[PDB]
Design a protein around this ligand. Structure first.
Ligand SMILES: *[C@@H]1O[C@H](CO[C@@H]2O[C@@H](C)[C@@H](O)[C@@H](O)[C@@H]2O)[C@@H](O[C@@H]2O[C@H](CO)[C@@H](O[C@@H]3O[C@H](CO[C@H]4O[C@H](CO)[C@@H](O)[C@H](O)[C@@H]4O)[C@@H](O)[C@H](O[C@H]4O[C@H](CO)[C@@H](O)[C@H](O)[C@@H]4O)[C@@H]3O)[C@H](O)[C@H]2NC(C)=O)[C@H](O)[C@H]1NC(C)=O
Ligand SMILES: *[C@@H]1O[C@H](CO[C@@H]2O[C@@H](C)[C@@H](O)[C@@H](O)[C@@H]2O)[C@@H](O[C@@H]2O[C@H](CO)[C@@H](O)[C@H](O)[C@H]2NC(C)=O)[C@H](O)[C@H]1NC(C)=O
Ligand SMILES: *[C@@H]1O[C@H](CO)[C@@H](O[C@@H]2O[C@H](CO)[C@@H](O)[C@H](O)[C@H]2NC(C)=O)[C@H](O)[C@H]1NC(C)=O
Ligand SMILES: *[C@@H]1O[C@H](CO)[C@@H](O)[C@H](O)[C@H]1NC(C)=O
Ligand SMILES: *[C@@H]1O[C@H](CO)[C@@H](O)[C@H](O)[C@H]1NC(C)=O
Ligand SMILES: *[C@@H]1O[C@H](CO)[C@@H](O)[C@H](O)[C@H]1NC(C)=O
Ligand SMILES: *[C@H]1O[C@H](CO)[C@@H](O)[C@H](O)[C@@H]1O
Ligand SMILES: *[C@H]1O[C@H](CO)[C@@H](O)[C@H](O)[C@@H]1O
Ligand SMILES: *[C@H]1O[C@H](CO)[C@@H](O)[C@H](O)[C@@H]1O
Ligand SMILES: *[C@H]1O[C@H](CO)[C@@H](O)[C@H](O)[C@@H]1O
Ligand SMILES: [Ca+2]
Ligand SMILES: [Ca+2]
Ligand SMILES: [Ca+2]
Ligand SMILES: [Ca+2]
Ligand SMILES: [Ca+2]
Ligand SMILES: [Ca+2]
Ligand SMILES: [Ca+2]
Ligand SMILES: [Ca+2]
Ligand SMILES: [Ca+2]
Ligand SMILES: [Ca+2]
Ligand SMILES: [Ca+2]
Ligand SMILES: [Ca+2]
Ligand SMILES: [Ca+2]
Ligand SMILES: [Ca+2]
Ligand SMILES: [Ca+2]
Ligand SMILES: [Ca+2]
Ligand SMILES: [Ca+2]
Ligand SMILES: [Ca+2]
Ligand SMILES: [Ca+2]
Ligand SMILES: [Ca+2]
Ligand SMILES: [Ca+2]
Ligand SMILES: [Ca+2]
Ligand SMILES: [Ca+2]
Ligand SMILES: [Ca+2]
Ligand SMILES: [Ca+2]
Ligand SMILES: [Ca+2]
Ligand SMILES: [Ca+2]
Ligand SMILES: [Ca+2]
Ligand SMILES: [Ca+2]
Ligand SMILES: [Ca+2]
Lengths: 625, 633
């Protein structure tokens, strides 16, 4: 056989070769035989006039042989007279008419952020229809620092390009990358194909949420109502998507997980917990955690009242207390602190007492002046302690001070001097008077007693005359008094209390003896014989009337009307002859003496007193001329 | 003429019959004469060689005679030499080549549900082109229970089938029926035609809307805000389409408006606030109707419940403005009632007294209470009381009511006036001016009014009861004591009085007090000398005194008295002046004038002395006296 070589896609009417020269047929021997090309598809034709082969239909190697290495089409040539056939095999060369081309103009790839460097990712190979050197040969990527190109070629021609990661990705630096890949064949000339690849770095949870500061500081009062916004902390996560979600947690208050704010749930208190320390943990979906701390310094409010403590209680104190003695001991204490715990105390009232501070929160009560029980025996004193909060809280305490009795008052009698008259011949041991003294003191100091100390009488008979009841003050006569023996007497008495020492008071009392008509009248002159007769026989007969015969003198031991002596005439031998002085007692002659009258004259008189009833003393007078 | 009989639809070139044998023409006489069939349309032909009749054009009886009773086709036959014509009439038989068939493959009928039984409905008759026995003869319908078929032929010859209703229809049982109708001819063989008929029962308004129950029961509080969904009622209509639309309405009831019903949804919700005290129960009648005026009604009973929204009330009916202090224990003071608008435990009211006042509540019957004294009362201690009464119900939460009463206690004369001191002691100086205040007594009476108005009187005295006015008097209103005379200590030293304080009540209460009044002594009386008596000059003579008298000789003794008492009457005797000092001795206490020393001859016989009687009063009062004493021999 014979072989010819032409390129594919050859235009029609092109000379493949003269068969007349290769088969040995003359230019005139040729038209005799009707040259006809025999083939399944009429790709060729023989113009009988020219005597050579010519291209007829379009010669598409990719549609006939395709990937076949050598395309050898065997057709026939028929010539008539004589009937003869010749088989001709033609081989066509591949033309680089099909440039390489990728399946998609653009396709995006999503690569994770935590992709390890050196990982190989497969890429779709472009489809180049030509075979041999005109086939796809070189894949080349844009020069950068993050990705690289690798060709993997086996002998079978199923070679493909893949992308090797050069450095680790980081979506926070550049979220996306756009590169151009070029496929190139080795033909004349070489023609290339471009394809864009866009890599979007998928987020990974490599950055944890971070707080603004390590330590925060907040101060709030202890009286905040439940629900006060204490503090809110905010964290920042460098990721995006779910890996950026931040949740807060604790690891009397309350924290919301999403908003991240901490608010109180119950009332605070300074006396139990002064400051709180809280630890907050922020976590994302992938367990990346970070913790911070917040210190809440609760402020001390003046909500507790200061207290006044009494330590020594003096129920009884002396009235003669010197100024400035330590009476009671007080302290002031407050649970709060600072100006809320500092307490200043004062006393309210006009009582003479002062507060003296010896040291911090230590005070003493002293007397400011001299005291007295009789004027003010009791005091209700009020003491006020106030702190230095704004506004302050105060505390009052009331003490009842009682004043004791000191023996500073002597018993006093109801009257300055006493005077008592007592009738004569009184029964002994009888009540004559009663004295009463008052002592304002209390207890034994107010127990009065009366005694006798001195008297103008003889000190030995002082007991025999009078005595005193020391408890009641009644005076008792120890003998029947005699107005004739003693007329009056002075006494001095003493009132004394039962204290230490005893205070005394002296009183003066005069006792008088009233005269009673207990003595009969006694005749002094003239003297009488046992019969009671006196004889005066020297009376002149020639005496003129009015002659002083004699005079009777009488006395009475009593005094006053009880001694008032009046002289009467009981009986007489001659009435009208004698005249008597009712007051003086002078017996005289009333008329002249007649001789008829008898020589012997008898008279009987009686001396009487003005008492009721009167006592009489009789006497007889014999008078002879 | 001559007649032949053949069937129609005969194929061409078929022998109908030999005309040579019926017309008498020889087989050689025939080609001489030009046998030709003469007709308007060449349905036949004569083959001269055959000498017989032959079919030429198509012989369609339906296009020639059609429905004509007898089909007689009359043509002629012309023969030439000699010219002669023969009339030929042929009669063709109808072929059963057209089977009966209805006009439409499917036709639907819409029949009402309330169609009376026995009604005839028209159906399209099939058209069979053949005539006679080959024509349509039998109409037959599928055997069922609701419809029947009947064939009707009118005088005009227009035969038709019709459907007779067997039973009344019901679209809720079977909404449609599909049957098969067969048309049959009476030929050999019979060929059939099928036609399907679908009857859709048209809806009628025979089913009313029906409720679930005749009577419903709902209970709601009396304090529901306007707009509370009271209840939801639903009705069911067995029809479909517009005849199934259900509308609700209020019908035949009290038109008073407190509820509200939506027509379509049928829910009832309140429109105003409820109340139990005015209307205890409500009755509602609901009407549900469709488009055709078919109605059905139901009833709902709303039993409103009594809520504890009314406060219990404490009614005071009797007011004890004045009550006696000596009220016996357990006396009826005040009359109270308790009332509550609510019911049940919401209307049950319990009343109590809070405080420390001595009063108790005693229940005589339901909601009937009385106030009684628990202890003894006193006006002086507590004259007025403010009592508080609390009434609480048994609802949750309960409602309470407090009421304050001001009771005043009257004064009863049960206290006698009391003096400030048990006994009184007052000293009054002698020679006091008459009508002057000497003392004042005060009595206290705890009673009020006239019972607490004290008055003082004099009742008893140790003095003469008739001159008591001349002695002392009392101001009965103030209690001051007034002396009606200048007192004399010498006449009387003291006197007793018994007085009584009495109020002006009924009866009067008295109290007696004893007072001793003492007259203070003043030194207003001078001492007077009794013995010896003195002449106008104040001289006394005691002569005839012996010169040889021993010392201690009692010259005389002076007696003197003083009307006063005490120091004002204590008489001491002094020596004012003397002609010879030391010659005479006087008793300072006794008053005895004696000789102190012996009488010398140098001394004169007559001795004069001047003494004074003094008292211990302040200042002392003195009485002077002169004594002349003469000696003899
Ligand atoms: C990949 O294919 C690229 C396209 O090339 C064409 O299409 C392929 C399929 C083949 O058919 C090929 O034969 C075709 O040429 C190709 O890119 C080309 O690269 C050349 C050289 O680098 C570029 O030539 C230079 O052009 C610039 C300015 O060009 C302007 O116009 C062109 C239109 O053609 C535009 O595309 C450009 O963007 C510009 O706007 C000139 O300044 C430069 O001058 C220099 O070179 C000349 C030589 O001719 C010297 O005389 C001068 O002194 C200068 O030194 C070039 O002329 C060409 O523009 C560019 N085309 C495109 C479309 O990008 C690339 O080479 C192929 N790669 C491989 C490996 O084959
Ligand atoms: C109360 O009387 C006593 C005794 O009085 C007597 O007369 C006085 C005027 C004076 O001279 C005293 O000496 C007489 O004894 C007085 O007190 C007593 O005095 C004595 C002597 O110094 C002494 O030993 C006693 O202890 C004293 N007794 C008392 C109780 O003090 C006293 O001065 C008179 N006055 C008063 C107010 O008590
Ligand atoms: C208080 O004194 C009055 C007045 O004397 C008394 O009333 C009378 O007392 C006397 C006895 O001395 C009776 O004879 C009378 O009958 C009493 N009068 C009456 C009762 O109206 C009275 O009894 C004394 N006591 C009191 C507590 O009033
Ligand atoms: C002082 O306290 C006492 C204690 O019982 C009281 O009785 C008295 O009345 C008080 N002082 C005054 C002035 O009320
Ligand atoms: C109609 O006629 C055919 C022919 O014999 C028969 O098979 C068929 O059953 C008939 N149908 C009815 C409904 O008569
Ligand atoms: C009673 O109430 C009146 C007026 O409110 C008041 O003046 C009086 O003091 C009260 N009495 C008592 C015992 O509460
Ligand atoms: C004793 O009795 C007399 C009565 O004679 C009172 O005067 C004295 O006070 C004491 O009681
Ligand atoms: C004096 O008076 C007294 C009074 O008793 C008489 O008894 C006596 O006899 C004389 O007459
Ligand atoms: C009248 O005056 C006297 C004083 O002289 C008082 O003692 C009495 O109480 C009344 O007031
Ligand atoms: C008594 O004493 C009084 C004075 O108290 C004198 O005035 C009078 O003359 C007599 O001597
Ligand atoms: Ca090609
Ligand atoms: Ca090619
Ligand atoms: Ca290529
Ligand atoms: Ca990163
Ligand atoms: Ca994260
Ligand atoms: Ca990230
Ligand atoms: Ca606190
Ligand atoms: Ca605090
Ligand atoms: Ca404090
Ligand atoms: Ca004192
Ligand atoms: Ca004292
Ligand atoms: Ca004392
Ligand atoms: Ca005597
Ligand atoms: Ca006498
Ligand atoms: Ca005497
Ligand atoms: Ca026909
Ligand atoms: Ca038929
Ligand atoms: Ca027919
Ligand atoms: Ca029905
Ligand atoms: Ca219906
Ligand atoms: Ca209906
Ligand atoms: Ca209500
Ligand atoms: Ca109620
Ligand atoms: Ca109610
Ligand atoms: Ca009373
Ligand atoms: Ca009373
Ligand atoms: Ca009274
Ligand atoms: Ca007088
Ligand atoms: Ca007097
Ligand atoms: Ca006098």
């Amino acid at each position: 056989q014979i072989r010819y070589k032409i390129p594919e896609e050859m235009p029609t009417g092109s000379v493949v070769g003269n068969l007349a020269k290769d088969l040995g047929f003359s230019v005139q021997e040729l038209p005799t035989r009707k040259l006809r090309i025999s083939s399944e598809k009429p790709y060729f034709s023989v113009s009988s006039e020219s005597g050579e082969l010519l291209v007829s239909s379009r010669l598409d190697r990719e549609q006939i042989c395709g990937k076949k290495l050598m395309c050898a089409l065997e057709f026939e040539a028929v010539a008539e007279n004589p009937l003869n056939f010749y088989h001709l095999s033609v081989e066509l060369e591949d033309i680089n008419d099909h440039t390489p081309k990728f399946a998609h103009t653009s396709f995006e790839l999503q690569i994770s952020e935590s992709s390890k460097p050196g990982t190989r990712f497969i890429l779709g190979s472009a489809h180049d229809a030509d075979i041999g050197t005109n086939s796809l040969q070189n894949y080349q990527l844009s020069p950068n620092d993050h990705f690289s190109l690798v060709n993997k070629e086996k002998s079978d021609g199923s070679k493909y390009p893949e992308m090797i990661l050069k450095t680790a990705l980081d979506r926070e630096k550049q979220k996306l990358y756009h590169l151009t890949l070029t496929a190139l064949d080795f033909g004349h000339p070489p023609l290339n194909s471009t394809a864009q690849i866009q890599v979007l770095v998928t987020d990974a949870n490599d950055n944890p949420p971070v707080f603004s500061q390590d330590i925060y500081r907040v101060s709030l009062p202890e009286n905040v109502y439940p629900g006060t916004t204490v503090l809110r902390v905010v964290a920042t996560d460098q990721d995006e998507g779910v890996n950026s979600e931040i949740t807060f947690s604790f690891s009397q208050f309350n924290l919301d997980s999403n908003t991240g704010e901490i608010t109180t749930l119950h009332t605070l208190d300074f006396e139990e917990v002064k400051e709180y320390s809280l630890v907050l943990e922020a976590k994302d979906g992938g367990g990346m955690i970070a913790q911070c701390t917040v210190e809440i310094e609760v402020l001390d409010e003046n909500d507790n009242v200061p207290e006044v403590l009494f330590q020594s209680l003096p129920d009884l104190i002396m009235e003669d207390a010197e100024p400035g003695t330590y009476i009671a001991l007080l302290k002031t204490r407050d649970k709060d602190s600072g100006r809320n715990g500092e307490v200043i105390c004062k006393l309210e009232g006009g009582a003479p007492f002062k507060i003296l501070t010896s040291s911090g929160n230590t005070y003493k009560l002293v007397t400011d002046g001299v005291l007295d029980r009789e004027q003010n025996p009791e005091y209700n004193i009020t003491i006020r302690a106030t702190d230095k909060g704004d506004p302050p809280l105060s505390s009052s305490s009331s003490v009842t001070l009682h004043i004791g009795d000191v023996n500073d008052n002597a018993p006093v009698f109801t009257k300055v001097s006493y005077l008592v008259h007592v009738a004569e011949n009184n029964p002994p041991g009888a009540s004559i008077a009663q004295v009463s003294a008052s002592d304002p003191d209390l207890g034994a100091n107010g127990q009065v007693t009366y005694y006798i100390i001195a008297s103008d009488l003889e000190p030995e008979s002082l007991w025999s005359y009078v005595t005193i009841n020391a408890q009641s003050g009644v005076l008792f006569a120890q003998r029947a008094f005699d107005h004739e023996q003693l007329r009056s007497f002075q006494l001095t008495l003493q009132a004394r209390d039962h204290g230490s020492p005893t205070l005394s008071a002296n009183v003066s009392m005069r006792l008088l003896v009233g005269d009673r008509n207990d003595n009969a009248p006694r005749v002094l002159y003239p003297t009488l014989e046992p019969d009671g007769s006196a004889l005066f026989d020297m009376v002149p007969r020639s005496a003129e009337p009015g002659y002083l015969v004699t005079k009777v003198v009488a006395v009475d031991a009593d005094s006053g009307h009880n001694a008032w002596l009046s002289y009467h005439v009981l009986q007489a031998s001659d009435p009208g002859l004698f005249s008597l002085g009712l007051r003086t007692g002078e017996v005289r002659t009333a008329r002249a003496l007649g001789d008829r009258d008898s020589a012997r004259q008898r008279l009987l008189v009686a001396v009487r007193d003005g008492g009721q009833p009167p006592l009489s003393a009789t006497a007889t007078l014999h008078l002879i001329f």
